[PDB]
Structures are given as C-alpha cells and as structure tokens.
Amino acid sequence: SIVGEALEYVNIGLSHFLALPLAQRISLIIIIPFIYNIVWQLLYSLRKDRPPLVFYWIPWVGSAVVYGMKPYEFFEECQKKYGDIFSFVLLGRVMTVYLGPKGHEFVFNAKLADVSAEAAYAHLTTPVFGKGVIYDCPNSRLMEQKKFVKGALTKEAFKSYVPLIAEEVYKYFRDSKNFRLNERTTGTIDVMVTQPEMTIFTASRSLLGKEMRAKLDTDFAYLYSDLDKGFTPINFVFPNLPLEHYRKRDHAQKAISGTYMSLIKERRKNNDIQDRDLIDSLMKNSTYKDGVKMTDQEIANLLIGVLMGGQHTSAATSAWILLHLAERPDVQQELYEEQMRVLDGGKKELTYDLLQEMPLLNQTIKETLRMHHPLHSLFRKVMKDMHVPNTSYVIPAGYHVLVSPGYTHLRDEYFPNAHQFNIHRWNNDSASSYSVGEEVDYGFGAISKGVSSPYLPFGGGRHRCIGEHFAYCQLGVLMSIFIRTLKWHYPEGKTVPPPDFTSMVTLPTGPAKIIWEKRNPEQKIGG
C-alpha cells in the first residue's frame, strides 16, 4: 500500500510548483483553469438532469461576446443544435434560456419562491433610481409600488394627458432646432436625438407635472442627461467605479430626487395636493398594506425609476416607428387617411377616446413592438431548484433563467414573414395586448393568468409592465401629430438600421437620419 509514498510526492510536487520561474507560474495560472474549464464542460455534458450547456473557450467570460452582439442570432443557432432549453455562461453567471411560449410560462409565471427578479436587477437599477424602490426592496413592496403608480394611469388620467402631450409635441415642432416648423418646411433629423427629447418633454409634462416640465427648460436638463448615461448594462458588472461617469450619475440622482422632494414638501406645506400628476397621486396614495408609508425620498426615487424606464422603452419605440415608416409611404398614406376620417379632416380635436378609434395607428405601434421589443432578454435569479416539466432537467439555485419574448416575435412559425413590417397582420386585433382567459392579481390589478402568448411586448406575471396604456397614449398622440403634420423619407441609399443589443433597450444603431417635410408648408404653430 504505497499511497504513503504517493502522498509524499504530492507534497513534493506542491513544493516544486513554487520553485518554477514566475513566467511558468503565470502560464500555469492561465492554462490550468482553461483546461479544467474544458474538462468540466465535457463532464457536465454527461448530465441528463441539466439542459445542454453552450460550449465556450474563455472561462468566466463564456459566450458573452456573441450573446451581446447578436443575442437573437445566438439564440437561433443554439435552438437549432440543442432545442428550446439550453444554458450558457455569461461573465461568471450561468444563464438558462427557455425559448418560445413554454419558456414564457416557465419564467414569467414561475413561483415567487423559485425565482427573484430583484436579485438579477438590483445592481442594474438601484444606483440610478436610488434606494428603497423597484428592485431595492422585497417583492411585496414592488407590487404595491406598481399599484400606487397605476393610480395615476386611469382612463380619466389619459383623457387629461392627451392635450398635454399634444401641446408638448407641437411646442417641440415649433421650438426645437431639429424642426422649427414656423421657419423651415423641410429638414434632416437624427431620430435618436429628437425622440429621447420628445419623450422626456411629453412624459415629464403629463406624469411629473408642469413644475418638473418647466425645469427641463433650464440647466437642470443636464442632470437628466447625466442620470440617463448612468442607465446602462455596464451596471450589471460595474455598478460603482470611482470614475467621473459614476459620480456625475450619483450627483444627478441626488439633485433630481432633491428637486422632486422639494416640490413634494412644498405641496404638502401649502396643502396643495390635487389630481394633476403622478406626484399628487403618490402623495395621496403611498401607504403599504402593513401601514408603513413611503418616504419622500422613496417617492422621488420611484418617480425617477418610472420616468427612466418609460423613457428608454418609449423613445426607442417611436424612433423605430419613424424609421420603418420612412421607407413606407404607403403606411404613412394609410395612417393619414385614418387621421382625416377619425378627426373629420382635422376639425376635431384629438382626445383619448378618438385615439381608440384609430386602429391602424395602434396596429403600427403594435407591429413596431413586435419587430423591436425594447428588452431582448429578461432575467430572474433562480432561488430554489426548478424541475423543467416534461423533461429530466433541473435548474439549480444560483443559476439564472432568461426569457426572450422578443425572440419569438421574430419567428416565422408564429408571425409569418416575421422580418417584414406589416401593420395589417393585426387587422381586427389592434389591442395593445389581450388577456385571452382567466386573470390574477399580484397586488397591482387583475392581469392575464396565462403568459403563453407568442406576443408579449409587456412581459407577464407578477413583473408585468403597468405602463402599457401610458405608452400607447403617448406614442399614439405623438404619431397622430407626426402623421398629420409631416411626411418623411430616407436620404438616398439609407434604410432601417439594425438594433443595438448592448444598450439598455434595443435602440437603432446611429446616426439614424430621416428627412421630413411639412404636409402644409404654410401651417403655423401659435404661442
């Protein structure tokens, strides 16, 4: 039994390792994890209680590069080889993807005990929004925060928002250097300049109120830019680095939330709390069901998060709407005729109810969100082992699950000719979304119990979006006015750009320029 002499040579070998020249040591510090990673994958591949794991060369990094550049093309290749459930390594994390409607069910309807959104997202959002809200709090708090925000998102609220949003659009056409319709009949714009600007102007005026919109006409607007630059997927890896980008971000968060808090405290002092905006609403309705009240700081931080999330999804979407219509004068013409019919040649004022009578306009939004889901991947951290039904698979705690309704939006099996933009695929189905059957309430209102729809621009289950009707209201007013006021087209040789999958939303790669011209060159915008 010469295991003793073998154990002596183990200790001897461990000693001889340290006497290697330093280059051989570093070389061994690199070659040994690499070889072990390959060996580990080969062994892992033997497992039958695990989904197939995408092979990768660089330890820790995994498939990060190819996933980040072209996630849908990555998914399609993986789907061909391995089917609908497969894992990949992403910067030290194991991501289990479940494609298609069954994956929507597996992730969006997973048990609260099994998965955690806030554990996946906290580092992404908390340094931008501030503490105590959205993902920096337990799920039950998030549920009620969504309930609070929904209280300012009623039909009656949208009826008041429409003329406010319309006013802001017309003001932008009049005053922005990108347009100046009283002085120019044609111009060239970068839609990733105009649309983020129009989106924050319209959303601040309606959700935040006249005071906070007024602020955007000052140097305070630079704080919003500074905060917007902090809203980036780099926060997943580097939420805080001692650089200037980060300190500009933190400073802006303090100053913007400070501005909101100043208005909040001034309103309470003056007893000036009406039903004007989301701030009024949160001042009157922000008590959790255990009787704890949101602080003024948490109210402000929630306002930041709502406005920032709504900012990126909606600005990206109206950019894509403009870009797809720039090569589709037929759609512009069809939309214009609908406007003339619904609004009696323009003699009728746009109202929230009339927006509902504009199916083609709404189908255009719907179809843009099919082809351009602003969020290509949604994440949950796995908290308890999950059995994948009808498989032998178990997804262990410490893994992440990734769901991608945006991938299914682009599958021919569910949307024939899925890479053609065609608003008429939605004829007699112009609703922003539809609960086909039974409903459930997680704390913010009854929503569809099933999430099997191949079309889920707004997600589903407890984390489902509550801004869908605001987004359609905002996008609808904005596009109604764009269509009635302008025609637009591409400069020669340009077409729809491909998306940027490394940004917070799948926005178009730039510079994405269109040329506009006034339908009525003599139309003037008053005020």
Ligand X SMILES: CCCCCCCCCCCCO[C@@H]1O[C@H](CO)[C@@H](O[C@H]2O[C@H](CO)[C@@H](O)[C@H](O)[C@H]2O)[C@H](O)[C@H]1O
Q: Which residues bind ligand X (CB under 6 A)?
A: 151-152, 154, 156-157, 160, 275-278, 280-281
Q: Which one among 374, 450, 497, 499 touches ligand HEM, defined by CB under 6 A?
A: 374
Q: Is 54 exposed, middle or buried (0-12, 13-18, 19+ CB in 10 A)?
A: buried
459 forms part of the interface with ligand HEM (CB under 6 A): yes
Residues 6+ apart with CB under 8 A from 213: 168, 201, 204, 205
Asked if residues 195 and 318 have their Cβ atoms less than 8 Å apart, the reply is: yes
301 binds, among ligand HEM, ligand X, ligand A1AB6, none (CB under 5 to 8 A by kind): none
Strand locations in 50-125, DSSP E?
85-90, 93-98, 115-116
Question: Measured from the CB atom, is 285 or 422 closer to ligand A1AB6?
Answer: 285
Number of residues forming the site for ligand A1AB6 (CB under 6 A): 19
Structure token pair of residue 464: 């489902």
Residue burial 444-479, b: 16+ Cβ < 10 Å; e: rest = beebbebbbbebbbbbbbbbbbbbbbbbbbbbbbbb
Q: Please spell the DSSP secondary structure of 152-171, one letter per residue.
A: T-SHHHHHHHHHHHHHHHHH
Among 103, 187, 309, 508, binds ligand HEM (CB under 6 A): 309
Which of residues 87, 253, 313, 362 is near ligand HEM by CB under 6 A?
313
425 marked as binding residue: no
What does DSSP assign to residue 189? E
- Structure token digits, residue 517: 């011209």
Q: Give the separation between CA 227 and CA 241, rounded to whole angstroms.
A: 15
Pseudo-torsion of CA 175, 179, 184, 190, nearest 10°?
150
89 sits near ligand HEM (criterion: CB under 6 A): no
Residue 328 or 376 having the CB closest to ligand A1AB6: 376
420 binds, among ligand HEM, ligand A1AB6, ligand X, none (CB under 5 to 8 A by kind): none
Q: Is 366 annotated as a binding residue?
A: no
Q: For residue 497, state whether it binds ligand HEM (rule: CB under 6 A).
A: no
Cα(463)–Cα(109) distance, integer angstroms: 9
Contacted entry of ligand HEM, ligand X, ligand A1AB6, none for residue 130, CB cut-off 5 to 8 Å set by kind:
none
How many angstroms from the chain centroid is the CA of residue 433? 17
Please indicate if the annotation marks 210 as binding a ligand.
no
399 annotated ligand binder: no
Separation CA 203–CA 37 (nearest Å): 49
Contact partner at residue 499 from ligand HEM, ligand A1AB6, ligand X, none, CB < 5 to 8 Å by partner kind? none
Q: 68 touches which of ligand X, ligand HEM, ligand A1AB6, none (CB within 5 to 8 A by kind)?
A: ligand A1AB6
Nearer to ligand A1AB6, 86 or 121 (CB): 121
State the minimum distance, in angstroms, from the CB of residue 381 to ligand A1AB6: 13
- Does position 305 interact with ligand A1AB6 (CB under 6 A)? The reply is yes
Q: Does 378 bind ligand HEM (CB under 6 A)?
A: yes
Q: Does 142 bind ligand HEM (CB under 6 A)?
A: yes
Q: Residue by residue, what is the 3-state secondary structure of 423-488?
A: HHHHCCCCCCCCCCCCEEECCCCEEECCCCCCCCCCCCHHHCCCCHHHHHHHHHHHHHHHHHHEEE
Longest dimension (CA), the chain: 101
CB of 506 vs ligand HEM, minimal distance in Å: 10
Flag whether 473 is marked binding.
no
Contact between 165 and ligand A1AB6 by CB under 6 A: the answer reads no
CA distance 13 to 31: 18
For ligand HEM, give the closer residue by CB, 53 or 465: 465
DSSP 236: G
Q: What, of ligand X, ligand HEM, ligand A1AB6, none, does residue 445 touch, CB below 5 to 8 Å by kind?
A: none
343: enclosing H helix or E strand: none
Instruction: Restricting to residues 107-126, name those near ligand HEM by CB under 6 A.
Output: 117
Site membership for ligand A1AB6, residue 310 (CB under 6 A) = yes
502 binds, among ligand HEM, ligand X, ligand A1AB6, none (CB under 5 to 8 A by kind): ligand A1AB6
- The one-letter amino acid at 59: P
Q: How near is the Cβ of 208 to ligand HEM at its closest, in Å?
A: 11
Task: Say which residue the tokens 């006034």 belong to.
Answer: 518
Question: Three-class SS string for 11-48?
Answer: HHHHHHHHCCCHHHHHHHHHHHHHHHHHHHHHHHCCCC
Q: Which CB sits closer to ligand HEM, 187 or 476?
A: 476
| Residues that bind ligand A1AB6 in the complex, under the rule CB under 6 A | 67-68, 121, 125, 134, 233, 305-306, 308-310, 313, 375, 377, 465, 467, 501-502, 504
| Residues that bind ligand HEM in the complex, under the rule CB under 6 A | 117, 142, 146, 306, 309-310, 313-314, 317, 369, 374-375, 378, 457-459, 463, 465-467, 470-471
